[PDB]
């Protein structure tokens, strides 16, 4: 319910898996293989394999086939015999994936290893990205990943966001359900249960758990600013301080010097730099240099 | 003779050795100047 | 609630990672390859890599790559596993990295080791930029860093903004709540608390104190100007004293010799300084003048 | 309150830092690097590092890279682990840094050794500058420097400005709060405080000390004129001698010679100077020459 | 980063910071506030004498 929102359990994680293929089927938008070498390399060894050899050194000019690396993500305590979405992408000259098919392609780990099997049918939206796809249950899982859990009598809850106040109330409303000495904080990030010896007590343990409800905290005051997208936005702890504010083209609705007054809440903070009358474009150059005087009490943040 | 020996033009020693410098007081400075003549 | 604005904690801090990457699936808007030769070099490797040797000396023009830089920071007490957000950003005459895929990329510290693996779709905004972008969640923890948290009976708040007054203000409050002789101030930026040996016990304690709340006494009354953005900003302990000021084009609204009376608080120096009628562009002048005459009784910052 | 705007403590002082980077991610506007070679050299030096070896003599053309000088300025009592505020500046043929990301870059003093390592997304204003960015908490603090604070039973306090009678006042303030030999005037610029040996006991004696309020005495009649920009500034205790005046194409509103009333305060002077109908630009002239016959009481200063 | 010399070629000062021009006026001239710090103190004999 809240817990799982706000944690993760170690050893519970996800991996990535990468591969080269091929996708056929394209309506003459595919590569254009006087340039990318590959893509007929490959094809002669798809076809060599299939037991039809090509003369070297022979002229081949394709138009249906493009070259394609395909990404996926290998979920936890994946079995052998399910499947995974994959992600497919063009890698050369490609005018578009439309209507394209992928052909076998293993996916391998950071090891060089096997993990998956992935063929099946692309689905370009269809402005909207044409040389980018996605393959709903295109991949099927292959080899299995061990795992010690279950075994001995401590599991770590990992926070998603560092905070001590936020561990402790954590380890509190555990203490408070599931018994006296259940839980302990190791830092601001980890939560240290005891669990029973098992493999089912331990299931029943972090399924109780998970669906816990807690009262968050209030974090710490900041304002976040995507100067490439052009955004800015400020949680509910922001204050401001009484100061004086100038900038080209801004005046008062009076001269060019504008007051700002003290800020308790948020309603005040947007009441009053609303009266500035800036675009957000303004109001990030404002905003730094508020930051460097002193009046925003708050924590900048160029993302 | 070529066995007789003679001193050199460039007598002495051909080297020298840095020396390393003072220990830099703990005032709150990250210059610091060695004793300049 | 005020302390965790204020402070940081010794020992918790974030660490910086970097890694170069290859993204995929443009729509032609990639590397010219042409002059970048990386971008092919570093192709072939992940070809070889994969199992495909390409000939060496051959041509291969592609359109739909392009190669990265990508960035993050390690958080604190960061545990394998979990995961963080990265920054994408262009490194050779690419077009855009609309609908790209970011291949999997080893994140490196400045000590040469691998520290996160990052893998995912980014989101450009979509003027905005874009050879530039943000991935969520797009890279995984992989090595984890010792520290000595929990280990002694003394952390050290270190505050964000040098002052005395501050640190003793913090230090008394710290006292008032917690016992006598729980904290020490040993500087303008540092304050000593003593905590109980152990884990548990030293989040109980910082879990206590960061969310305490003190008054903030009044900082040195400064002007801070932003040339090049056009901006100044004035916190609220700036005073004025009477002098006359001239320059070109301002006038009384009277000759081109105009007043400037006393002002205590800032209300009256926003006021004084308005009755001039000049632009921040011609305010910028005015203060320095002023500041180097004797008028302005603050502290002038070009930033 | 008072004495904190006025004096500096010894020992607490700001240092500089410095140090190259390179900054990537822009749309196209970055160096023209076939006549900047040390941008595609540190290139090189950089994916060497990471792993890659790019062959020498070979032709590379990037657009998204710019090198770039990165400045800062190092706190006093700095801590490991702190952050602080970096300006990046374009270095060769550069055309905008607008959303640009820093690499890892590390700062040095003066003896060349690493106070911060500095990484973060650039803000640029958005006319205004674009070959200069800030960043806000773009450093990390790494190296500490020793001090002698706390050690010894004196302190000096630094006055901004030389002043006999404001050191005297000074002293007899802080004499007048703290006991009777708490301060001696060394000169027109320090003050010796006698502390209590320690570190705290030192802290409360400058946090009781620099929130004292002192009355400032007058200070010395001067004129500011600057040249470059065009203005004058005249402090409160400005006087004039009745003298007479001409200059081309101002007249009386009588002739060209006009009268000059002696002036004892400040709005007598900025009268008596209004009459003669001048604008700034003159002024300065007229100024000049006054102070060279013996007109003008004051002390003129060509900033 | 400059070093200030005095008239015996000592180091008296560093500078470093950023430059107002004003912004008819003049372009390639600037003013520096606190952009320099003191490194070097020069003796004197204040103090001494009647
Ligand atoms: C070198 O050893 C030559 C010395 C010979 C001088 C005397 C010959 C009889």
Known sequence: ?303 | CAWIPAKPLVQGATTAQPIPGPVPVANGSIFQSAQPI
Chains 1, 3, 4 share one sequence.
């Open chain 1, 1 to 303: 319910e809240r817990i799982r929102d706000l944690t993760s359990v170690q050893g519970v994680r996800e991996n990535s898996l990468i591969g080269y293929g091929l996708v056929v089927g394209l309506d003459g938008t595919g590569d254009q293989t006087t340039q990318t070498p590959f893509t007929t390399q490959t094809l002669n060894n798809m076809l060599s394999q299939l037991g039809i050899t090509v003369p070297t050194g022979t002229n081949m000019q394709l138009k249906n086939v493009a070259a394609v690396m395909v990404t996926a993500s290998y979920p936890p305590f994946a079995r052998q015999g399910q499947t995974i979405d994959v992600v497919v992408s063009s890698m050369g000259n490609a005018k578009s994936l439309r209507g394209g098919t992928l052909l076998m392609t293993p996916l391998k780990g950071v090891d060089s290893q096997v993990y998956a099997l992935a063929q099946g049918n692309i689905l370009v939206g269809g402005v909207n990205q044409l040389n980018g796809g996605r393959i709903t249950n295109g991949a099927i899982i292959e080899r299995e990943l061990p795992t010690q859990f279950g075994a001995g009598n401590t599991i770590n809850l990992q926070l998603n966001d560092e905070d001590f106040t936020m561990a402790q109330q954590i380890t509190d409303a555990i203490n408070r359900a599931r018994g006296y000495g259940s839980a302990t904080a190791l830092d601001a990030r980890t939560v240290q249960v005891r669990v029973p010896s098992g493999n089912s007590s331990q299931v029943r343990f972090l399924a109780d758990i998970q669906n816990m409800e807690v009262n968050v905290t209030p974090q710490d005051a900041k304002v976040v600013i995507n100067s490439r997208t052009g955004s800015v936005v400020m949680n509910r702890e922001v204050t401001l301080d009484s100061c004086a504010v100038a900038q080209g083209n801004l005046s008062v609705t009076g001269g060019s010097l504008q007051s700002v007054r003290s800020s308790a809440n948020l309603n005040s903070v947007v009441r009053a730099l609303n009266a500035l009358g800036a675009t957000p474009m303004d109001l990030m150059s404002i905003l730094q240099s508020m930051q460097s005087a002193g009046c925003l009490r708050a924590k900048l943040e160029i993302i």
